[PDB]
Amino acid sequence: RTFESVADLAAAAGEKVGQSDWVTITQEEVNLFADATGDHQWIHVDPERAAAGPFGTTIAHGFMTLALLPRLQHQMYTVKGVKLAINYGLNKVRFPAPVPVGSRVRATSSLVGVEDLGNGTVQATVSTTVEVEGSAKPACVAESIVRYV
Amino acid sequence: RTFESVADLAAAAGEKVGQSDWVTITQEEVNLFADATGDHQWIHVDPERAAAGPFGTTIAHGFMTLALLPRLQHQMYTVKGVKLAINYGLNKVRFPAPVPVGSRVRATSSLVGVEDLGNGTVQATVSTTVEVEGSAKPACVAESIVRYV
């Protein structure tokens, strides 16, 4: 979905804004994430230890699944007439089920609200569910905030 | 600080649990984060465009600064008698000030509460403020939930 401007996004407040394609969680992404953030916990990056652990194989970092929101939402929609978009923050986020490396995830989002901040800048509150393929329990249910400048 | 057990963690509810060292956020880390998560927005990874945009230089992804919580908290305390710690979620996160690439950040955390889930598995709710060395406003204010399994 392409919004023609921030006014059109604002006028869509409340609406579903789509569903991503499936994306596959790869070990190299998990490893990059660990390198970027300094979280090399064995459950994410040590296949031998992880295989003996309670998850059976390596799992994604919850903070990475959350950080996939921009990528996934990009597949659902875009907003024209915007110079930049910046993460304003999160309200409630939960990670009900782990995401095994090798599994596929997909997201669906709706616009909770869009606040006019003046001069063509708007702040959108978005609700997302990230599902894991083959499983009823979500990988993530999150409310996020994005400022379109 | 070493908590000898999750019971000892529970007894420390309502206490400060420490302050990290300063860590420098590099362009290399910001690029790896972009690769890991698929967010390659110009404000984070395009020196020329960023140099010319509202921040004058590249800034970290908010999702990355938030994802520094595990590394920074590991500098503050550890909990013995547990196999792993998993991110269960967040109650609120805000990013008052951007983190210019090359800047230093440091975190202070306090223990909000500890819930025993059964089996030696406990869930700690933690408040963190991440400061960034060149601005008055914090880089990140988060309340997070960590499950020790």
PDB file of N, CA and C in Angstrom, chain A residues 29 32-33 35-39 41-44 49 52-55 59 61-64 66-71 83-96 98 144-145 149, chain B residues 29-30 32-33 35-39 41-44 52-55 59 61-64 66-71 83-96 98 144-145 149:
ATOM      1  N   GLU A  29      22.280 -13.832  10.005  1.00  0.00           N
ATOM      2  CA  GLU A  29      21.649 -12.623  10.533  1.00  0.00           C
ATOM      3  C   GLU A  29      21.738 -12.575  12.056  1.00  0.00           C
ATOM      4  N   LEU A  32      25.321 -11.612  12.920  1.00  0.00           N
ATOM      5  CA  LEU A  32      25.482 -10.193  12.683  1.00  0.00           C
ATOM      6  C   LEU A  32      24.852  -9.400  13.822  1.00  0.00           C
ATOM      7  N   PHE A  33      23.663  -9.834  14.247  1.00  0.00           N
ATOM      8  CA  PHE A  33      22.948  -9.093  15.290  1.00  0.00           C
ATOM      9  C   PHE A  33      23.746  -9.129  16.599  1.00  0.00           C
ATOM     10  N   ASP A  35      26.996  -9.592  16.897  1.00  0.00           N
ATOM     11  CA  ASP A  35      28.186  -8.752  16.672  1.00  0.00           C
ATOM     12  C   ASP A  35      27.868  -7.259  16.798  1.00  0.00           C
ATOM     13  N   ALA A  36      26.714  -6.850  16.279  1.00  0.00           N
ATOM     14  CA  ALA A  36      26.296  -5.454  16.306  1.00  0.00           C
ATOM     15  C   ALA A  36      26.006  -4.974  17.735  1.00  0.00           C
ATOM     16  N   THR A  37      25.352  -5.814  18.527  1.00  0.00           N
ATOM     17  CA  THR A  37      24.801  -5.399  19.830  1.00  0.00           C
ATOM     18  C   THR A  37      25.561  -5.902  21.061  1.00  0.00           C
ATOM     19  N   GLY A  38      26.491  -6.829  20.874  1.00  0.00           N
ATOM     20  CA  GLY A  38      27.250  -7.377  21.992  1.00  0.00           C
ATOM     21  C   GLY A  38      26.519  -8.452  22.779  1.00  0.00           C
ATOM     22  N   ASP A  39      25.403  -8.965  22.245  1.00  0.00           N
ATOM     23  CA  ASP A  39      24.748 -10.110  22.896  1.00  0.00           C
ATOM     24  C   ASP A  39      25.123 -11.390  22.156  1.00  0.00           C
ATOM     25  N   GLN A  41      24.924 -14.440  23.559  1.00  0.00           N
ATOM     26  CA  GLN A  41      24.503 -15.507  24.447  1.00  0.00           C
ATOM     27  C   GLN A  41      24.437 -16.796  23.650  1.00  0.00           C
ATOM     28  N   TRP A  42      24.901 -17.855  24.287  1.00  0.00           N
ATOM     29  CA  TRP A  42      24.978 -19.172  23.661  1.00  0.00           C
ATOM     30  C   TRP A  42      23.693 -19.632  22.973  1.00  0.00           C
ATOM     31  N   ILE A  43      22.545 -19.325  23.582  1.00  0.00           N
ATOM     32  CA  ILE A  43      21.239 -19.703  23.010  1.00  0.00           C
ATOM     33  C   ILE A  43      21.019 -19.164  21.598  1.00  0.00           C
ATOM     34  N   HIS A  44      21.745 -18.105  21.232  1.00  0.00           N
ATOM     35  CA  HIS A  44      21.653 -17.492  19.890  1.00  0.00           C
ATOM     36  C   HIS A  44      22.755 -17.934  18.924  1.00  0.00           C
ATOM     37  N   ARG A  49      26.067 -25.840  22.046  1.00  0.00           N
ATOM     38  CA  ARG A  49      25.431 -25.597  23.326  1.00  0.00           C
ATOM     39  C   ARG A  49      23.906 -25.490  23.171  1.00  0.00           C
ATOM     40  N   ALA A  52      21.916 -28.638  22.957  1.00  0.00           N
ATOM     41  CA  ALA A  52      21.773 -29.295  24.248  1.00  0.00           C
ATOM     42  C   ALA A  52      20.862 -28.510  25.198  1.00  0.00           C
ATOM     43  N   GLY A  53      20.484 -27.300  24.790  1.00  0.00           N
ATOM     44  CA  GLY A  53      19.683 -26.415  25.630  1.00  0.00           C
ATOM     45  C   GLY A  53      18.188 -26.668  25.470  1.00  0.00           C
ATOM     46  N   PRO A  54      17.366 -25.962  26.261  1.00  0.00           N
ATOM     47  CA  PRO A  54      15.917 -26.167  26.314  1.00  0.00           C
ATOM     48  C   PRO A  54      15.175 -25.861  25.015  1.00  0.00           C
ATOM     49  N   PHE A  55      15.800 -25.106  24.100  1.00  0.00           N
ATOM     50  CA  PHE A  55      15.176 -24.791  22.813  1.00  0.00           C
ATOM     51  C   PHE A  55      15.524 -25.794  21.693  1.00  0.00           C
ATOM     52  N   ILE A  59      18.158 -19.907  18.775  1.00  0.00           N
ATOM     53  CA  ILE A  59      16.999 -19.043  18.566  1.00  0.00           C
ATOM     54  C   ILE A  59      17.414 -17.595  18.313  1.00  0.00           C
ATOM     55  N   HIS A  61      17.383 -13.504  18.800  1.00  0.00           N
ATOM     56  CA  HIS A  61      17.280 -12.563  19.885  1.00  0.00           C
ATOM     57  C   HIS A  61      15.895 -11.936  19.794  1.00  0.00           C
ATOM     58  N   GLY A  62      15.199 -11.832  20.919  1.00  0.00           N
ATOM     59  CA  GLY A  62      13.899 -11.135  20.900  1.00  0.00           C
ATOM     60  C   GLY A  62      14.034  -9.731  20.367  1.00  0.00           C
ATOM     61  N   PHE A  63      15.111  -9.042  20.759  1.00  0.00           N
ATOM     62  CA  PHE A  63      15.348  -7.686  20.267  1.00  0.00           C
ATOM     63  C   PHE A  63      15.580  -7.663  18.742  1.00  0.00           C
ATOM     64  N   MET A  64      16.026  -8.775  18.172  1.00  0.00           N
ATOM     65  CA  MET A  64      16.126  -8.798  16.715  1.00  0.00           C
ATOM     66  C   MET A  64      14.755  -8.969  16.101  1.00  0.00           C
ATOM     67  N   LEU A  66      11.963  -8.011  17.171  1.00  0.00           N
ATOM     68  CA  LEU A  66      11.362  -6.674  17.309  1.00  0.00           C
ATOM     69  C   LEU A  66      11.909  -5.687  16.277  1.00  0.00           C
ATOM     70  N   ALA A  67      13.232  -5.721  16.088  1.00  0.00           N
ATOM     71  CA  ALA A  67      13.951  -4.851  15.144  1.00  0.00           C
ATOM     72  C   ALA A  67      13.668  -5.169  13.670  1.00  0.00           C
ATOM     73  N   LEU A  68      13.011  -6.307  13.408  1.00  0.00           N
ATOM     74  CA  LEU A  68      12.546  -6.617  12.056  1.00  0.00           C
ATOM     75  C   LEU A  68      11.269  -5.861  11.678  1.00  0.00           C
ATOM     76  N   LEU A  69      10.655  -5.164  12.636  1.00  0.00           N
ATOM     77  CA  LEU A  69       9.416  -4.420  12.334  1.00  0.00           C
ATOM     78  C   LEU A  69       9.560  -3.474  11.122  1.00  0.00           C
ATOM     79  N   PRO A  70      10.609  -2.613  11.095  1.00  0.00           N
ATOM     80  CA  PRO A  70      10.804  -1.767   9.899  1.00  0.00           C
ATOM     81  C   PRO A  70      10.852  -2.574   8.577  1.00  0.00           C
ATOM     82  N   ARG A  71      11.717  -3.580   8.492  1.00  0.00           N
ATOM     83  CA  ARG A  71      11.812  -4.406   7.273  1.00  0.00           C
ATOM     84  C   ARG A  71      10.431  -4.951   6.839  1.00  0.00           C
ATOM     85  N   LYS A  83      10.778  12.835   4.490  1.00  0.00           N
ATOM     86  CA  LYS A  83      12.231  12.983   4.480  1.00  0.00           C
ATOM     87  C   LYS A  83      12.908  11.838   5.211  1.00  0.00           C
ATOM     88  N   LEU A  84      12.419  11.552   6.416  1.00  0.00           N
ATOM     89  CA  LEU A  84      12.945  10.435   7.209  1.00  0.00           C
ATOM     90  C   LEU A  84      11.853   9.921   8.161  1.00  0.00           C
ATOM     91  N   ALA A  85      12.038   8.672   8.611  1.00  0.00           N
ATOM     92  CA  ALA A  85      11.210   8.052   9.640  1.00  0.00           C
ATOM     93  C   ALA A  85      12.122   7.608  10.773  1.00  0.00           C
ATOM     94  N   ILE A  86      11.715   7.899  11.998  1.00  0.00           N
ATOM     95  CA  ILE A  86      12.562   7.613  13.146  1.00  0.00           C
ATOM     96  C   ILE A  86      11.734   6.902  14.212  1.00  0.00           C
ATOM     97  N   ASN A  87      12.332   5.855  14.770  1.00  0.00           N
ATOM     98  CA  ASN A  87      11.759   5.120  15.890  1.00  0.00           C
ATOM     99  C   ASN A  87      11.548   6.064  17.089  1.00  0.00           C
ATOM    100  N   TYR A  88      10.294   6.276  17.468  1.00  0.00           N
ATOM    101  CA  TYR A  88      10.021   7.126  18.632  1.00  0.00           C
ATOM    102  C   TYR A  88       9.962   6.297  19.916  1.00  0.00           C
ATOM    103  N   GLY A  89       9.679   5.002  19.775  1.00  0.00           N
ATOM    104  CA  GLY A  89       9.648   4.136  20.964  1.00  0.00           C
ATOM    105  C   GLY A  89       8.660   2.989  20.836  1.00  0.00           C
ATOM    106  N   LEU A  90       8.419   2.289  21.960  1.00  0.00           N
ATOM    107  CA  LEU A  90       7.523   1.137  22.021  1.00  0.00           C
ATOM    108  C   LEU A  90       6.590   1.353  23.211  1.00  0.00           C
ATOM    109  N   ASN A  91       5.352   0.866  23.135  1.00  0.00           N
ATOM    110  CA  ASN A  91       4.589   0.690  24.364  1.00  0.00           C
ATOM    111  C   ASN A  91       4.738  -0.789  24.731  1.00  0.00           C
ATOM    112  N   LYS A  92       3.659  -1.530  24.974  1.00  0.00           N
ATOM    113  CA  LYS A  92       3.807  -2.928  25.359  1.00  0.00           C
ATOM    114  C   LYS A  92       4.318  -3.830  24.237  1.00  0.00           C
ATOM    115  N   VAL A  93       5.313  -4.666  24.575  1.00  0.00           N
ATOM    116  CA  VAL A  93       5.868  -5.681  23.677  1.00  0.00           C
ATOM    117  C   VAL A  93       5.982  -6.999  24.445  1.00  0.00           C
ATOM    118  N   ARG A  94       5.560  -8.100  23.830  1.00  0.00           N
ATOM    119  CA  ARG A  94       5.743  -9.436  24.446  1.00  0.00           C
ATOM    120  C   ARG A  94       6.245 -10.387  23.372  1.00  0.00           C
ATOM    121  N   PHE A  95       6.980 -11.416  23.794  1.00  0.00           N
ATOM    122  CA  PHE A  95       7.587 -12.397  22.892  1.00  0.00           C
ATOM    123  C   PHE A  95       7.103 -13.785  23.352  1.00  0.00           C
ATOM    124  N   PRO A  96       5.845 -14.153  23.031  1.00  0.00           N
ATOM    125  CA  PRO A  96       5.250 -15.378  23.582  1.00  0.00           C
ATOM    126  C   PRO A  96       5.929 -16.693  23.215  1.00  0.00           C
ATOM    127  N   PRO A  98       9.583 -18.546  21.189  1.00  0.00           N
ATOM    128  CA  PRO A  98      10.877 -18.302  20.564  1.00  0.00           C
ATOM    129  C   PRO A  98      10.822 -18.497  19.054  1.00  0.00           C
ATOM    130  N   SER A 144       4.288  -0.067  18.540  1.00  0.00           N
ATOM    131  CA  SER A 144       5.483   0.730  18.251  1.00  0.00           C
ATOM    132  C   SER A 144       5.051   2.115  17.826  1.00  0.00           C
ATOM    133  N   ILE A 145       6.008   3.038  17.802  1.00  0.00           N
ATOM    134  CA  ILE A 145       5.740   4.431  17.456  1.00  0.00           C
ATOM    135  C   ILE A 145       6.796   4.898  16.466  1.00  0.00           C
ATOM    136  N   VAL A 149       8.928  12.376   9.395  1.00  0.00           N
ATOM    137  CA  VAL A 149       9.392  13.770   9.298  1.00  0.00           C
ATOM    138  C   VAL A 149       9.496  14.266   7.850  1.00  0.00           C
TER     139      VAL A 149
ATOM    140  N   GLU B  29      29.347  -1.012  13.622  1.00  0.00           N
ATOM    141  CA  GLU B  29      28.266  -1.678  14.356  1.00  0.00           C
ATOM    142  C   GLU B  29      26.917  -1.314  13.778  1.00  0.00           C
ATOM    143  N   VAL B  30      26.771  -0.054  13.384  1.00  0.00           N
ATOM    144  CA  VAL B  30      25.498   0.451  12.856  1.00  0.00           C
ATOM    145  C   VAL B  30      25.194  -0.232  11.515  1.00  0.00           C
ATOM    146  N   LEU B  32      26.437  -3.272  10.585  1.00  0.00           N
ATOM    147  CA  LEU B  32      26.152  -4.680  10.842  1.00  0.00           C
ATOM    148  C   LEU B  32      24.691  -4.814  11.276  1.00  0.00           C
ATOM    149  N   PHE B  33      24.219  -3.857  12.083  1.00  0.00           N
ATOM    150  CA  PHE B  33      22.827  -3.848  12.553  1.00  0.00           C
ATOM    151  C   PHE B  33      21.838  -3.744  11.393  1.00  0.00           C
ATOM    152  N   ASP B  35      22.527  -4.595   8.310  1.00  0.00           N
ATOM    153  CA  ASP B  35      22.563  -5.887   7.591  1.00  0.00           C
ATOM    154  C   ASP B  35      21.734  -6.971   8.287  1.00  0.00           C
ATOM    155  N   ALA B  36      21.861  -7.050   9.616  1.00  0.00           N
ATOM    156  CA  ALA B  36      21.139  -8.042  10.406  1.00  0.00           C
ATOM    157  C   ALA B  36      19.614  -7.880  10.283  1.00  0.00           C
ATOM    158  N   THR B  37      19.145  -6.637  10.267  1.00  0.00           N
ATOM    159  CA  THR B  37      17.704  -6.361  10.440  1.00  0.00           C
ATOM    160  C   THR B  37      16.974  -5.860   9.183  1.00  0.00           C
ATOM    161  N   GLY B  38      17.726  -5.502   8.139  1.00  0.00           N
ATOM    162  CA  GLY B  38      17.112  -4.973   6.927  1.00  0.00           C
ATOM    163  C   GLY B  38      16.662  -3.526   7.016  1.00  0.00           C
ATOM    164  N   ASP B  39      17.074  -2.798   8.047  1.00  0.00           N
ATOM    165  CA  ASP B  39      16.823  -1.367   8.077  1.00  0.00           C
ATOM    166  C   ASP B  39      18.090  -0.651   7.609  1.00  0.00           C
ATOM    167  N   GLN B  41      18.078   2.563   6.401  1.00  0.00           N
ATOM    168  CA  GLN B  41      17.671   3.933   6.152  1.00  0.00           C
ATOM    169  C   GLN B  41      18.906   4.839   6.094  1.00  0.00           C
ATOM    170  N   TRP B  42      18.862   5.809   5.191  1.00  0.00           N
ATOM    171  CA  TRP B  42      19.976   6.729   5.002  1.00  0.00           C
ATOM    172  C   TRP B  42      20.463   7.409   6.287  1.00  0.00           C
ATOM    173  N   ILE B  43      19.543   7.773   7.187  1.00  0.00           N
ATOM    174  CA  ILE B  43      19.915   8.429   8.452  1.00  0.00           C
ATOM    175  C   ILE B  43      20.909   7.602   9.296  1.00  0.00           C
ATOM    176  N   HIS B  44      20.946   6.289   9.081  1.00  0.00           N
ATOM    177  CA  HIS B  44      21.845   5.410   9.834  1.00  0.00           C
ATOM    178  C   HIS B  44      23.103   5.048   9.053  1.00  0.00           C
ATOM    179  N   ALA B  52      24.154  15.609   5.260  1.00  0.00           N
ATOM    180  CA  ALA B  52      23.331  16.705   4.724  1.00  0.00           C
ATOM    181  C   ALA B  52      21.931  16.789   5.335  1.00  0.00           C
ATOM    182  N   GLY B  53      21.567  15.821   6.172  1.00  0.00           N
ATOM    183  CA  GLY B  53      20.235  15.823   6.772  1.00  0.00           C
ATOM    184  C   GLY B  53      20.199  16.503   8.126  1.00  0.00           C
ATOM    185  N   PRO B  54      19.061  16.392   8.831  1.00  0.00           N
ATOM    186  CA  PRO B  54      18.738  17.126  10.063  1.00  0.00           C
ATOM    187  C   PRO B  54      19.673  16.826  11.246  1.00  0.00           C
ATOM    188  N   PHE B  55      20.320  15.677  11.223  1.00  0.00           N
ATOM    189  CA  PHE B  55      21.224  15.314  12.306  1.00  0.00           C
ATOM    190  C   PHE B  55      22.693  15.653  12.046  1.00  0.00           C
ATOM    191  N   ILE B  59      23.087   8.496  12.604  1.00  0.00           N
ATOM    192  CA  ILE B  59      22.660   8.170  13.977  1.00  0.00           C
ATOM    193  C   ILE B  59      22.365   6.664  14.090  1.00  0.00           C
ATOM    194  N   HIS B  61      20.353   3.183  14.991  1.00  0.00           N
ATOM    195  CA  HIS B  61      18.960   2.742  15.001  1.00  0.00           C
ATOM    196  C   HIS B  61      18.507   2.749  16.462  1.00  0.00           C
ATOM    197  N   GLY B  62      17.340   3.304  16.750  1.00  0.00           N
ATOM    198  CA  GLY B  62      16.754   3.166  18.106  1.00  0.00           C
ATOM    199  C   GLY B  62      16.653   1.707  18.530  1.00  0.00           C
ATOM    200  N   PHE B  63      16.368   0.819  17.578  1.00  0.00           N
ATOM    201  CA  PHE B  63      16.224  -0.587  17.936  1.00  0.00           C
ATOM    202  C   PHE B  63      17.568  -1.152  18.342  1.00  0.00           C
ATOM    203  N   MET B  64      18.658  -0.544  17.854  1.00  0.00           N
ATOM    204  CA  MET B  64      19.967  -1.029  18.254  1.00  0.00           C
ATOM    205  C   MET B  64      20.303  -0.561  19.663  1.00  0.00           C
ATOM    206  N   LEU B  66      18.350   0.221  22.048  1.00  0.00           N
ATOM    207  CA  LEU B  66      17.502  -0.598  22.935  1.00  0.00           C
ATOM    208  C   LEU B  66      18.132  -1.976  23.130  1.00  0.00           C
ATOM    209  N   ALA B  67      18.603  -2.579  22.035  1.00  0.00           N
ATOM    210  CA  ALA B  67      19.222  -3.913  22.035  1.00  0.00           C
ATOM    211  C   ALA B  67      20.608  -3.966  22.691  1.00  0.00           C
ATOM    212  N   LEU B  68      21.165  -2.803  23.042  1.00  0.00           N
ATOM    213  CA  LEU B  68      22.359  -2.791  23.887  1.00  0.00           C
ATOM    214  C   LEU B  68      22.079  -3.151  25.367  1.00  0.00           C
ATOM    215  N   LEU B  69      20.811  -3.262  25.755  1.00  0.00           N
ATOM    216  CA  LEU B  69      20.483  -3.519  27.166  1.00  0.00           C
ATOM    217  C   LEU B  69      21.154  -4.768  27.755  1.00  0.00           C
ATOM    218  N   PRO B  70      21.066  -5.918  27.060  1.00  0.00           N
ATOM    219  CA  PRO B  70      21.780  -7.104  27.567  1.00  0.00           C
ATOM    220  C   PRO B  70      23.290  -6.912  27.812  1.00  0.00           C
ATOM    221  N   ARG B  71      24.021  -6.381  26.839  1.00  0.00           N
ATOM    222  CA  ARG B  71      25.471  -6.151  27.028  1.00  0.00           C
ATOM    223  C   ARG B  71      25.723  -5.233  28.227  1.00  0.00           C
ATOM    224  N   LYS B  83      20.449 -21.231  33.609  1.00  0.00           N
ATOM    225  CA  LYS B  83      21.054 -21.715  32.376  1.00  0.00           C
ATOM    226  C   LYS B  83      21.112 -20.634  31.301  1.00  0.00           C
ATOM    227  N   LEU B  84      20.114 -19.751  31.294  1.00  0.00           N
ATOM    228  CA  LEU B  84      19.982 -18.768  30.224  1.00  0.00           C
ATOM    229  C   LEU B  84      19.047 -17.660  30.659  1.00  0.00           C
ATOM    230  N   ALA B  85      19.134 -16.539  29.960  1.00  0.00           N
ATOM    231  CA  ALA B  85      18.198 -15.443  30.161  1.00  0.00           C
ATOM    232  C   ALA B  85      17.561 -15.101  28.808  1.00  0.00           C
ATOM    233  N   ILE B  86      16.234 -15.002  28.793  1.00  0.00           N
ATOM    234  CA  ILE B  86      15.491 -14.729  27.554  1.00  0.00           C
ATOM    235  C   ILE B  86      14.627 -13.475  27.677  1.00  0.00           C
ATOM    236  N   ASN B  87      14.606 -12.700  26.595  1.00  0.00           N
ATOM    237  CA  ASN B  87      13.862 -11.449  26.553  1.00  0.00           C
ATOM    238  C   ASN B  87      12.364 -11.778  26.449  1.00  0.00           C
ATOM    239  N   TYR B  88      11.595 -11.433  27.483  1.00  0.00           N
ATOM    240  CA  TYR B  88      10.158 -11.722  27.481  1.00  0.00           C
ATOM    241  C   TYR B  88       9.361 -10.519  26.948  1.00  0.00           C
ATOM    242  N   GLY B  89       9.918  -9.324  27.077  1.00  0.00           N
ATOM    243  CA  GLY B  89       9.246  -8.189  26.459  1.00  0.00           C
ATOM    244  C   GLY B  89       9.619  -6.862  27.082  1.00  0.00           C
ATOM    245  N   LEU B  90       8.802  -5.846  26.804  1.00  0.00           N
ATOM    246  CA  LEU B  90       9.055  -4.462  27.235  1.00  0.00           C
ATOM    247  C   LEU B  90       7.705  -3.886  27.627  1.00  0.00           C
ATOM    248  N   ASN B  91       7.685  -3.014  28.627  1.00  0.00           N
ATOM    249  CA  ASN B  91       6.455  -2.320  28.976  1.00  0.00           C
ATOM    250  C   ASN B  91       6.378  -0.923  28.373  1.00  0.00           C
ATOM    251  N   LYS B  92       7.530  -0.290  28.192  1.00  0.00           N
ATOM    252  CA  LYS B  92       7.581   1.054  27.560  1.00  0.00           C
ATOM    253  C   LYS B  92       9.010   1.352  27.175  1.00  0.00           C
ATOM    254  N   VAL B  93       9.186   2.032  26.043  1.00  0.00           N
ATOM    255  CA  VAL B  93      10.527   2.455  25.614  1.00  0.00           C
ATOM    256  C   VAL B  93      10.360   3.811  24.931  1.00  0.00           C
ATOM    257  N   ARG B  94      11.270   4.737  25.230  1.00  0.00           N
ATOM    258  CA  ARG B  94      11.292   6.023  24.541  1.00  0.00           C
ATOM    259  C   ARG B  94      12.740   6.321  24.180  1.00  0.00           C
ATOM    260  N   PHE B  95      12.930   7.136  23.132  1.00  0.00           N
ATOM    261  CA  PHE B  95      14.267   7.475  22.645  1.00  0.00           C
ATOM    262  C   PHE B  95      14.378   8.995  22.578  1.00  0.00           C
ATOM    263  N   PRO B  96      14.518   9.651  23.742  1.00  0.00           N
ATOM    264  CA  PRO B  96      14.461  11.133  23.758  1.00  0.00           C
ATOM    265  C   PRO B  96      15.468  11.850  22.850  1.00  0.00           C
ATOM    266  N   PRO B  98      18.697  11.327  19.779  1.00  0.00           N
ATOM    267  CA  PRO B  98      19.438  10.441  18.878  1.00  0.00           C
ATOM    268  C   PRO B  98      20.864  10.137  19.370  1.00  0.00           C
ATOM    269  N   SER B 144      11.986  -3.190  30.827  1.00  0.00           N
ATOM    270  CA  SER B 144      12.150  -4.461  30.099  1.00  0.00           C
ATOM    271  C   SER B 144      11.890  -5.634  31.048  1.00  0.00           C
ATOM    272  N   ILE B 145      11.671  -6.809  30.471  1.00  0.00           N
ATOM    273  CA  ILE B 145      11.370  -7.996  31.254  1.00  0.00           C
ATOM    274  C   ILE B 145      12.315  -9.087  30.779  1.00  0.00           C
ATOM    275  N   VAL B 149      16.030 -18.639  33.255  1.00  0.00           N
ATOM    276  CA  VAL B 149      15.522 -20.016  33.093  1.00  0.00           C
ATOM    277  C   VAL B 149      16.565 -21.047  33.540  1.00  0.00           C
TER     278      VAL B 149
END
